[PDB]
Amino acid sequence: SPIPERGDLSCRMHTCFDVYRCGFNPKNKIKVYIYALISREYNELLMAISDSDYYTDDINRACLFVPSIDVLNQNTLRIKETAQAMAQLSRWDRGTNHLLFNMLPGGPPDYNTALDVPRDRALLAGGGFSTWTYRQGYDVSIPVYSPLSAEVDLPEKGPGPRQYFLLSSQVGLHPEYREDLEALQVKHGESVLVLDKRKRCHKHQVFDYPQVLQEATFCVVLRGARLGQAVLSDVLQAGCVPVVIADSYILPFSEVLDWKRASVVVPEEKMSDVYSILQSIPQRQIEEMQRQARWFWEAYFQSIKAIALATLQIINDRIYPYAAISYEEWNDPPAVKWGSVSNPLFLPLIPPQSQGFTAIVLTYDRVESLFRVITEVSKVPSLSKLLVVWNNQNKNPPEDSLWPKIRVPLKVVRTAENKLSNRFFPYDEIETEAVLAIDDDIIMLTSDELQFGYEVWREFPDRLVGYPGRLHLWDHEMNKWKYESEWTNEVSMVLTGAAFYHKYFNYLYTYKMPGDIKNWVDAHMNCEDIAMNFLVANVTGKAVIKVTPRKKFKCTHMVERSECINKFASVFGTMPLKVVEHRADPV
Amino acid sequence: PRQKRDANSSIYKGKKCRMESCFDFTLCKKNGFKVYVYPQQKGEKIAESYQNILAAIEGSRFYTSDPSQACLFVLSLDTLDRDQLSPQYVHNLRSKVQSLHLWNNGRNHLIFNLYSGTWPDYTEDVGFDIGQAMLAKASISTENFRPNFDVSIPLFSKDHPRTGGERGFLKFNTIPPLRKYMLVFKGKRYLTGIGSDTRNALYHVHNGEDVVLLTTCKHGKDWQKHKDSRCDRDNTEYEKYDYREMLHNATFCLVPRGRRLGSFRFLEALQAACVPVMLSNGWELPFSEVINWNQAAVIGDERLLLQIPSTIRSIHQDKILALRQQTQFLWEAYFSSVEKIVLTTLEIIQDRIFKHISRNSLIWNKHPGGLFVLPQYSSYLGDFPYYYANLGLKPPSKFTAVIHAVQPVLKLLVAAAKSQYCAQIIVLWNVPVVVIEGESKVMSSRFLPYDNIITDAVLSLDEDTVLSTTEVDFAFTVWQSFPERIVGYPARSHFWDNSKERWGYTSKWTNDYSMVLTGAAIYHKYYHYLYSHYLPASLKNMVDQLANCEDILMNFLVSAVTKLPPIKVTQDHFAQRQSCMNTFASWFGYMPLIHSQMRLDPV
Numbered sequence A: 001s002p003i004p005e006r007g008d009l010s011c012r013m014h015t016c017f018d019v020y021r022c023g024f025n026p027k028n029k030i031k032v033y034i035y036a037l038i039s040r041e042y043n044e045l046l047m048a049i050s051d052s053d054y055y056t057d058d059i060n061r062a063c064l065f066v067p068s069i070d071v072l073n074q075n076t077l078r079i080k081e082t083a084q085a086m087a088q089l090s091r092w093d094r095g096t097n098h099l100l101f102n103m104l105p106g107g108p109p110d111y112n113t114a115l116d117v118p119r120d121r122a123l124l125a126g127g128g129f130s131t132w133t134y135r136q137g138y139d140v141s142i143p144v145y146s147p148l149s150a151e152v153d154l155p156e157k158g159p160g161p162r163q164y165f166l167l168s169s170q171v172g173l174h175p176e177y178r179e180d181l182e183a184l185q186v187k188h189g190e191s192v193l194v195l196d197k198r199k200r201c202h203k204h205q206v207f208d209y210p211q212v213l214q215e216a217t218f219c220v221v222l223r224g225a226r227l228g229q230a231v232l233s234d235v236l237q238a239g240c241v242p243v244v245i246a247d248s249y250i251l252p253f254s255e256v257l258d259w260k261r262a263s264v265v266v267p268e269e270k271m272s273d274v275y276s277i278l279q280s281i282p283q284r285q286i287e288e289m290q291r292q293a294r295w296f297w298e299a300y301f302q303s304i305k306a307i308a309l310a311t312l313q314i315i316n317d318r319i320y321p322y323a324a325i326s327y328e329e330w331n332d333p334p335a336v337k338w339g340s341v342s343n344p345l346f347l348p349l350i351p352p353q354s355q356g357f358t359a360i361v362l363t364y365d366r367v368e369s370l371f372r373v374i375t376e377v378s379k380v381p382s383l384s385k386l387l388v389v390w391n392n393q394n395k396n397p398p399e400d401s402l403w404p405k406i407r408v409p410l411k412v413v414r415t416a417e418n419k420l421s422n423r424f425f426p427y428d429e430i431e432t433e434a435v436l437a438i439d440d441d442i443i444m445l446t447s448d449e450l451q452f453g454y455e456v457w458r459e460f461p462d463r464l465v466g467y468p469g470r471l472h473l474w475d476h477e478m479n480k481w482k483y484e485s486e487w488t489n490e491v492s493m494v495l496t497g498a499a500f501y502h503k504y505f506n507y508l509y510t511y512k513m514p515g516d517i518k519n520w521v522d523a524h525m526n527c528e529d530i531a532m533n534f535l536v537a538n539v540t541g542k543a544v545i546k547v548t549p550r551k552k553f554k555c556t557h558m559v560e561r562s563e564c565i566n567k568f569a570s571v572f573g574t575m576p577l578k579v580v581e582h583r584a585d586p587v
Numbered sequence B: 001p002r003q004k005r006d007a008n009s010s011i012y013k014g015k016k017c018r019m020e021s022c023f024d025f026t027l028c029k030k031n032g033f034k035v036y037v038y039p040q041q042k043g044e045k046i047a048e049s050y051q052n053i054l055a056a057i058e059g060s061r062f063y064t065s066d067p068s069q070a071c072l073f074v075l076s077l078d079t080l081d082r083d084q085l086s087p088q089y090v091h092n093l094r095s096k097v098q099s100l101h102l103w104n105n106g107r108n109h110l111i112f113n114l115y116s117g118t119w120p121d122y123t124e125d126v127g128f129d130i131g132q133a134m135l136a137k138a139s140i141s142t143e144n145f146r147p148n149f150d151v152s153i154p155l156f157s158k159d160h161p162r163t164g165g166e167r168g169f170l171k172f173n174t175i176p177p178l179r180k181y182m183l184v185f186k187g188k189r190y191l192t193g194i195g196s197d198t199r200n201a202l203y204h205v206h207n208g209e210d211v212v213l214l215t216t217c218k219h220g221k222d223w224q225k226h227k228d229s230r231c232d233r234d235n236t237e238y239e240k241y242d243y244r245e246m247l248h249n250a251t252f253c254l255v256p257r258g259r260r261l262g263s264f265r266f267l268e269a270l271q272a273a274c275v276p277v278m279l280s281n282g283w284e285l286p287f288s289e290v291i292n293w294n295q296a297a298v299i300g301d302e303r304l305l306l307q308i309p310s311t312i313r314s315i316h317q318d319k320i321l322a323l324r325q326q327t328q329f330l331w332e333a334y335f336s337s338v339e340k341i342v343l344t345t346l347e348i349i350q351d352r353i354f355k356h357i358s359r360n361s362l363i364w365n366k367h368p369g370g371l372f373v374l375p376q377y378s379s380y381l382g383d384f385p386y387y388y389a390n391l392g393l394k395p396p397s398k399f400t401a402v403i404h405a406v407q408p409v410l411k412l413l414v415a416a417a418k419s420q421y422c423a424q425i426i427v428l429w430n431v432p433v434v435v436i437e438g439e440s441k442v443m444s445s446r447f448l449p450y451d452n453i454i455t456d457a458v459l460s461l462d463e464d465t466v467l468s469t470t471e472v473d474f475a476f477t478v479w480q481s482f483p484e485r486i487v488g489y490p491a492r493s494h495f496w497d498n499s500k501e502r503w504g505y506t507s508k509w510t511n512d513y514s515m516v517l518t519g520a521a522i523y524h525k526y527y528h529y530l531y532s533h534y535l536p537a538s539l540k541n542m543v544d545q546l547a548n549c550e551d552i553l554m555n556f557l558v559s560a561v562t563k564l565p566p567i568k569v570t571q572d573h574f575a576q577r578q579s580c581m582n583t584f585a586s587w588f589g590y591m592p593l594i595h596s597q598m599r600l601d602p603v
């Protein structure tokens, strides 16, 4: 029977992979085909593959191939027979796109840190990779599965202080490892705990192995066989920060998972310096690493389904980098994801004064006061454009000759409906970044006032700058939020009337708002200002900058505002508004 | 055991070198990372680009003149251009490098290379036997890249700035991010050779409205000799645009493979803010082992050339915005100057020595970058002011008062102690109060890192500045909103003199400000470390000699790190400041100081 050539280390995506098979599709996900024929682990792998969105039929359509031959354990693999089968696969094509899954790439006479089968061009997802046997953009490093993750369910113990500092629970280590661990234990004592040969036996003391790891803040993972140990998954599950002392070992999913925030890698020469290395790490970093290790276990190390999905996702990002998921989404726990901001306007650029701001003015059944404010607004320098949105559909716009004489190109937008959320629509006529939203009732603003507001906005392009000031307080008797404006010792919102903000915020309001706030506001004809403040605070994660030493900007309201605030807090799951006690006024 | 490690070291000492085999960690063995530059022989030509590289290394903080102390070596010989047809090629280099006393088979040598290979079948022809040396080559193929040994560096011209910055072209962050064109390219095409297959097939995808790609075969003698049946039309269409107007008016810029995988168009694309769409197969992008290029560019296989425009159109709008901003951040962080490139290479090498003291995948790919974030201070992101939004952490609620003393000082200590946010007070002589003995009247020693400072925020305050407790609380509350800046009362500005072409300093009734003085200022403790372990000894020594200008350098450093102005809050000696500012601008290469007309006040 034919046998392929040995694994080629000079085999990358741009040479071995065939991108013609999976060119482009709307849902940018690769297609995986499975050969019809096995260990229960490999069965769970194939079931996970078949029950995902990467599984397809009509072999001519699929881009990746996963043969149904058990390769996970190489101790009883019968290399030659597996090679004959892979050659016989009838669609091998020199293994151009075939994906192989393995977790123990070790041979009893010698450990090659890679699959010993020919696998000329086959792509490997192996549990143990050295930096010499791992192809960078071609291969995937995967965890080695431990049955304990399904056999025992450890309690979700939170981060905190623990009895032991450095723990080493492994079986059959090389004598030098044992000698140096014993030296560390005898040097320090009562903190370093080494366990001898699912039960751990210390001198005249017994522990349960999966649960003893819960009592240590650092756990040692050594290189004894295959360069990849199943103890790593147990260490991550128990929450203790792993300490990997393998010399040349590439951790699982290192392409996308940032292990610098979840583990400590110490070269095995400096083993006597391990304790001094770990003592330098402060408590907060230890807690963060415990959290990250637990998240890594619960997301990728938990079951074979997680491993298969992560491997296919990594390959998919390799095939379609433009649609790849973010490394932040990859390593952040759900709690961090909820807490994280990820500001989209993160680039710190200060726009030049040569540009301007397109003032958008909203009126309905008010013409004699719209004119009085458009006249004053038009005086402001660096006002590139002025848009007036006409809400009242029954009434007609005034005559063009009746409009004032201004220095800027005016335009009038004919609304299809009468909704107060139409002022936040991203207009293609807006050629600037800053957008000045001003209301007809707002009159006590000078040209210097607006110019200073715009100048302040230029220093904070990514947040909300507004003249009026409102905030929210918490009452114990109603156990809810209230809308407070009578007094001001702090601020958390500025009304959209007389406010400067980026047009990206208009885009967010129109499209990326959750599906409840926009329709609720279009129903209630109120609380657009509060919704915009909530959205800005949630997306940018920053406070709001008031710009006036002034409060009076005009010549069942409050209950409705409180209801709006409570509803907006409920739909976001929290209260994104941040209270600040500072205002910006000119020097 | 150790036998296995020795066997691995011996066996893999070749093309497959890594750090655990082809390196010696014993020479660094400390936080002090030092690089030694071989002295000039004064007998060979020196290219301007390699001269800039060596000046960046020499003027850096990793430079040492003692070969025993260093654990990284850089040759002074010209290695950037290894093409035999180039006018910068150095002959007899193979025998010349073996005559060096400190070569030691190039065990700990870093070699910079930008061009390799000759006219037929361009390859990695460095000429001399590199041995164990890791090369910071520009155009590296994927199958010829050592995953964690070599460094892929950008390819830059001889006119690339050495210390200064070009600031980028994205002045307006306009929405929609789309521009007049969708995908552009304007470069030569080669009739015969290697690397012209992708350039010859651009006329299929050329559209003329959104995807406009222009090529010419006029590249020498073949301008009329072997021209095919398309050179005439291609050249007539080519002479219609400018390659600069069409670069700043395009959302995406195509960067295909030429003769070599790397190209001059990459840095131009990053400067122009247009998202680069790379087509060269098997290219290790600059700092690919350190920078996530999926967040700053588009990577597409040139085998799937025809359907690229559909894929580029399918890219969502917010993704385009994120890519466009990431491009500018990368340009201003790691590619704006030769100094930034060289220091990026050295810092990437340094991160491989101590794996427990290094930068995570988030520091590099986020503001302000790895050059201003030194992991020796702390590998924990919460100890830096820049990473609170990315995490779920609020800024510290406690600060440390530091008073540099050379009476109001007694009243000042009492007033500051009454603050609810004050944990400890440190008094410098040249709530628990701490007094630290001083050995010299070095007034820049007030910025040193101290083990007694527990809080992240540090209030630096001179003895002659009387500050009320309520003012301290208000300033700290303001700083909690902007943890990355300097928040203080006394502010001074800067100006440009046309009469003398020298920067100027004002301190009276200015219309704006660009510096806030450290006499009544609040800032993160990390800037104490960055002031000491990042700024060169020359500037700080000049500060000590003149007995002023330490706070001006403080503001310079903070503005350079944050690219944002300080925030003022309220409610013969003079001639030295101008020279100080001019020297600081000369070292930095530009003026990080930014004017600001805002002033925060309590409500």
Ligand SMILES: *[C@@H]1O[C@H](CO)[C@@H](O[C@@H]2O[C@H](CO)[C@@H](O[C@@H]3O[C@H](CO)[C@@H](O)[C@H](O)[C@@H]3O)[C@H](O)[C@H]2NC(C)=O)[C@H](O)[C@H]1NC(C)=O
Pocket: A337, A338, A339, A340, A341, A514, A537, A538, A539, A541, A571, A572, A573, A574, A575, A576
């Ligand atoms: C910005 O707004 C988003 C919502 O659009 C916030 O994300 C939401 O955060 C809350 C917690 O603050 C999450 O609630 C959680 O739900 C899980 C069940 O899925 C529950 O077990 C937890 O106890 C908690 O109640 C909510 O799921 C989450 N929603 C989404 C879509 O992510 C985000 O936190 C806001 N960010 C800021 C800075 O305000």
